[PDB]
RNA sequence: CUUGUGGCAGUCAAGCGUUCAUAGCGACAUUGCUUUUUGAUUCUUCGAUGUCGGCUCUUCCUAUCAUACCGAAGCAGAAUUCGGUAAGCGUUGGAUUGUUCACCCACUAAUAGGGAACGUGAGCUGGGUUUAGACCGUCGUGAGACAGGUUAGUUUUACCCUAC
RNA sequence: GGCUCAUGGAGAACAGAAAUCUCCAGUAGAACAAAAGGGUAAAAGCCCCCUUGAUUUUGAUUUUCAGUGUGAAUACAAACC
RNA sequence: UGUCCCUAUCUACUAUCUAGCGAAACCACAGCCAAGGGAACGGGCUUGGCAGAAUCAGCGGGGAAAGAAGACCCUGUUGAGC
RNA sequence: UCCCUCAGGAUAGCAGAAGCUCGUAUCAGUUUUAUGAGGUAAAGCGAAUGAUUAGAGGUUCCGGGGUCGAAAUGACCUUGACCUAUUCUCAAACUUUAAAUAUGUAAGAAGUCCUUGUUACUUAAUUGAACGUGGACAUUUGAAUGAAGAGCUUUUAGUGGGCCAUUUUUGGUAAGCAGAACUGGCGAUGCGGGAUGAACCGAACGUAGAGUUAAGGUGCCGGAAUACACGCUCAUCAGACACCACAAAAGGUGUUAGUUCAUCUAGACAGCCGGACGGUGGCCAUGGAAGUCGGAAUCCGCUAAGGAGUGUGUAACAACUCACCGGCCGAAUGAACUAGCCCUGAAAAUGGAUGGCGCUCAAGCGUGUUACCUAUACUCUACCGUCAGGGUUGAUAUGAUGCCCUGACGAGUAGGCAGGCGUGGAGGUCAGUGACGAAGCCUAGACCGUAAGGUCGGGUCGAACGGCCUCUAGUGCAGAUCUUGGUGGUA
């Protein structure tokens, strides 16, 4: 894996463009804040921006909001990875592991 | 001429469909428990049964 | 490359208030490297690891005067194939970082010493001339210096030329 | 041939301990075992009756039977792809209580005290445990702590 | 594949060589290279790849016996020895042996070592090996056994494709 | 139930390296039928007293394991000692 | 005494060409090499060298050529003579 | 696991199918917190067992003897037994200590707390023990994350030669050798890359489009910079990408960088040339040793300096000559090491392979930076199918096994199961087709179907044949050195 600290902007872009929910499993695109406040209105979240809030600021209903969200299906990055060989650790000149703030850049490219 | 023994693929085989817990019932196996504790325990439970059969009025 | 101030402390466990705040001058291409190297060096000096401590500050350091020509006397240690050896090299450059990446290149070129097998012990600018040891630097410290560039190889953007190209300058 | 005897491969484990030879200390016998009590299995080689197999050495089960000099323990024995219900008959020197279950059974009463208290007061209890949280924002003060500029060391023999 | 074993080749040099480590050799050690031995292995082949040696014939390897031209010497000459470039050039006739190996006689400038399915059986030969007959010795009560000895023992096909 | 073993030390006619006697040290360096390992110091060892639990009834349990057998072992229960 | 040094020459009948008559063995598809890797010795695969119809007489390098479910060795709970 | 078992079987496992009981459970090849167990890596031997090198000290009482007044339960020793404190190095079958990784258990309704009920068990007892009655605490249901549904059963296929790779590891000189441990792979697997390759790297596969990338590369073959940047290397045997198709010790004033010490206002190195001495025939060894047989001493004189002597020379001298300083010159040197790339070391057979070509401030080696090329991978979209969850003939005619909505998914040997295609017959039906042409065969003509196959046109031909719903089987061929018959190439 590659992981890091997801900024507000990058979280917003991900949940907008790649917002999919688990409803009777059947992975359903959100496309409407009615579909969020149907399933997650129980926990008080009534919107896309209310869901993005309960993620970006780790809420009392983080577990629920995060497990509701379907695993994001990202594509390969826009200009590539840089990195001639990926499967070294980021520190060495690879890509895998904890890239603190540089995940934001990667993820937007992969979006 | 052959080979003798290997534990290769034996984990994979086991984990594919298996490794499972024995389900743990309430009121467990009261067999191989102290025979004189059992001999008494019967009469205790029969006593409690009579006492609630008396209580039912 | 970049030069980074890295101040890490130690975990403040009460019975031990105010741990002694250890500062470094790490050479690294970003913060995620600069902080990993900080821990690498302080694990060779003190009983503390990233779990048992914390980075309290990381700050990029720039050049005081990034357009003054400087003679950087750099002390370095490197793992060779057979053993390890302490070296002193003299880079001439305009920044501390630019001098250091030239050292890393001329260490990789001359002793096959890659990034993992090099420690930058010190990068001190030489104050007064007549302290410059190495001739490959004392060359460029001569009064009223000039020198030509014979065999000037111009480069076409098209396969064919019509003139029989010259190498004059 | 090959050796698969009962006490085979058990040189070092049924070994007694350094300067802990000789007699068993009497607390071992005065200790009370009841059914449903979780107990460890660790043989005392000095005592060669009701001793467990080397498999069960290190295991933890729950007492099912209680008799004169001995208990009965239920242990989970994985064989191939499934656990079985293995009933041991152990003399009381080969077992001990598990502080595992002692620290839980006191946390139950600590939760019972916290809740029964905070039902009739200003409430912010949060009875569940939480793991090691990412440390909060602190200011580190450099008053007589002006950071020591460390440098890496030159190489030298010895 | 491997390189123990075999064969060849270094490094160090206590020393042998009047004196003198290294002209020529070299202890105690130690690093290799090779696949012309012998092993180790069992990967290919058991609806067969004709199983030793010789005869013939070509090509290649060089770890060079001679020849060409050189360097070194405990090289005066002659003679010899140690190397270099070097495989262009050649490197035999016989007695006994099936033998490969070996051993003698003799000439030669020299009678170097090897590979190419341990080259070469639709090229030969068939002495040896290893079918069936037979004799001897030792072993076995015996049938029989012997990588002990001895004698007699069928060597098939090209007109196909390629190569020449 | 009594005692302490190896070995060493200082000593008593014949008696000495070695026969018996006495004291001092002695964590086991002895001994426990054998192989080896573990265990054991008012004992599991050595000496002495009484016995026959090396018995009857069948079941459960552990190791090997298919959770079959065989062997060995464990812990009870009911009798009698 | 051509067994040989060391080969030569001759005769007949073949072969060869023609008219007539006219089979068989074998045949996955086939038919140029070098190295490479690969069931560790390729016609085909990879990389090179290369490569021009139709062919005739010879030849015995190769096609691990053909002949035959190895007869040697092992296995088989397959037999037989003795 | 068992078998006269080792080319085989039964057994359990892995597998498929049929389902079934219920509806997000208290499950998990996972972490955390708490609590066990371990004797392996490491370490240790001035800690036990065992091994093991070196002295010092005491030996005193004792095993070897006088050196000695014959003679000393004795002055000086070598001494063996030891003891003491030190010392060097070790252990698969030593060990005080003791990891990492793996591993047990717990983290709550079958829970906790407060009363009280029988009992032939146990208690001195009215004490307990097991199970309960009756109450009380459900927002935080008592760690994290996930959950694709969770549990249950029956039956039966194939298999039981395996092999490979990093890491741990036994035997062995070793092996593309033999045998283990954990995991991942091939088998059973295509695709992009390593030229080629079962196993390596990257990624696992319905049919297409578009976009982006992986590993790997971007002189030309060859899609893609004869890109940029700092260095190194010149080889009459260069080097060139992991597994992988090799090279070692030892050497080089080849060239680059580096480490330590020493010399410099005449260095000093150079690189030429003035002297190398008197006392003194320095002691002993001896015909002889006088500077050079050695045991060894080592001072001076004017001193610029010269060993009471570095090599030739002699029986022994003598002599020439080395340090040692100096007239000359004029601004860096003298070693001893260390590692980079080259070079020596470096020899096998057909001709020959960094994949080829070629490449020399590279198209080599080390390193950095962008750009760029492209996989059956990733994203979006279409269509096919499978599976899942739903909606709906509600008077609402046209299909409820129907139609339709939504979501995910698609590799495969051995093997299982399902849905179909085709053949000879059989029962029923289409009042089926047909001498104005059945069936058969031929067809670089057409249409349908993912496919098995179906349908049609044209020709030849001349007497039968078909669709559909069902029944039944001597029912589908490329292989069997298959059978019969026919035919070839060789020719």
UniProtKB/Swiss-Prot annotation, chain A:
Location in the cell: Cytoplasm
Note: Present with 101000 molecules/cell in log phase SD medium.
Organism this protein belongs to: Saccharomyces cerevisiae (strain ATCC 204508 / S288c)
Primary gene name: RPL7A
Full-protein interval shown: 134 to 244 of 244
Assembly, per entry: Component of the large ribosomal subunit (LSU). Mature yeast ribosomes consist of a small (40S) and a large (60S) subunit. The 40S small subunit contains 1 molecule of ribosomal RNA (18S rRNA) and 33 different proteins (encoded by 57 genes). The large 60S subunit contains 3 rRNA molecules (25S, 5.8S and 5S rRNA) and 46 different proteins (encoded by 81 genes).
Protein name: Large ribosomal subunit protein uL30A
Sequence similarity: Belongs to the universal ribosomal protein uL30 family.
Domain of life (superkingdom): Eukaryota
Its biological purpose: Component of the ribosome, a large ribonucleoprotein complex responsible for the synthesis of proteins in the cell. The small ribosomal subunit (SSU) binds messenger RNAs (mRNAs) and translates the encoded message by selecting cognate aminoacyl-transfer RNA (tRNA) molecules. The large subunit (LSU) contains the ribosomal catalytic site termed the peptidyl transferase center (PTC), which catalyzes the formation of peptide bonds, thereby polymerizing the amino acids delivered by tRNAs into a polypeptide chain.
From Swiss-Prot, chain B:
Compositional bias (Basic residues): 1-24
Record-linked InterPro entries: Ribosomal_eL29 (IPR002673)
Principal cellular location given in the protein's record: cytoplasm
Cross-link Glycyl lysine isopeptide (Lys-Gly) (interchain with G-Cter in ubiquitin) mapped to chain: 50
Alphabetized UniProt keyword annotations: Cytoplasm, Isopeptide bond, Ribonucleoprotein, Ribosomal protein, Ubl conjugation
The UniProt record lists the keyword Ribosomal protein: yes
GO molecular function: structural constituent of ribosome
Short name of any one Pfam family annotated for the protein: Ribosomal_L29e
UniProt superkingdom: Eukaryota
Record GO biological process: cytoplasmic translation
Family: Belongs to the eukaryotic ribosomal protein eL29 family.
Its job: Component of the ribosome, a large ribonucleoprotein complex responsible for the synthesis of proteins in the cell. The small ribosomal subunit (SSU) binds messenger RNAs (mRNAs) and translates the encoded message by selecting cognate aminoacyl-transfer RNA (tRNA) molecules. The large subunit (LSU) contains the ribosomal catalytic site termed the peptidyl transferase center (PTC), which catalyzes the formation of peptide bonds, thereby polymerizing the amino acids delivered by tRNAs into a polypeptide chain.
Other notes: Present with 51100 molecules/cell in log phase SD medium.
PANTHER family, per the entry: 60S RIBOSOMAL PROTEIN L29
Protein's UniProt name: Large ribosomal subunit protein eL29
Lineage: Eukaryota, Fungi, Dikarya, Ascomycota, Saccharomycotina
Gene from which this protein is expressed: RPL29
Curated annotation (Swiss-Prot), chain C:
Signal peptide: none
Keyword Transcription: no
Residues in cross-link Glycyl lysine isopeptide (Lys-Gly) (interchain with G-Cter in ubiquitin): 122, 128, 146
Family matches, as InterPro entries: Ribosomal_eL20, Ribosomal_eL20_dom, Ribosomal_eL20_eukaryotes
Places the protein is found: Cytoplasm
Keyword tags: Cytoplasm, Isopeptide bond, Phosphoprotein, Ribonucleoprotein, Ribosomal protein, Ubl conjugation
Stated family: Belongs to the eukaryotic ribosomal protein eL20 family.
Assembly and binders: Component of the large ribosomal subunit (LSU). Mature yeast ribosomes consist of a small (40S) and a large (60S) subunit. The 40S small subunit contains 1 molecule of ribosomal RNA (18S rRNA) and 33 different proteins (encoded by 57 genes). The large 60S subunit contains 3 rRNA molecules (25S, 5.8S and 5S rRNA) and 46 different proteins (encoded by 81 genes). eL20 forms multiple interactions with RNA and proteins in the central protuberance, connecting components of core functional centers that are located far apart.
Name of the protein: Large ribosomal subunit protein eL20A
Organism of origin: Saccharomyces cerevisiae (strain ATCC 204508 / S288c)
UniProtKB/Swiss-Prot annotation, chain D:
Crosslink (Glycyl lysine isopeptide (Lys-Gly) (interchain with G-Cter in ubiquitin)) position: 31
GO terms under cellular component: cytosol; cytosolic large ribosomal subunit
GO biological process, one term: cytoplasmic translation
Keywords of the record: Cytoplasm, Isopeptide bond, Ribonucleoprotein, Ribosomal protein, Ubl conjugation
Subunit structure as annotated in this protein's UniProt entry: Component of the large ribosomal subunit (LSU). Mature yeast ribosomes consist of a small (40S) and a large (60S) subunit. The 40S small subunit contains 1 molecule of ribosomal RNA (18S rRNA) and 33 different proteins (encoded by 57 genes). The large 60S subunit contains 3 rRNA molecules (25S, 5.8S and 5S rRNA) and 46 different proteins (encoded by 81 genes).
Family: Belongs to the eukaryotic ribosomal protein eL21 family.
Protein name stated in the entry: Large ribosomal subunit protein eL21A
Organism: Saccharomyces cerevisiae (strain ATCC 204508 / S288c) (Baker's yeast)
Name of the gene encoding the protein in the UniProt record: RPL21A
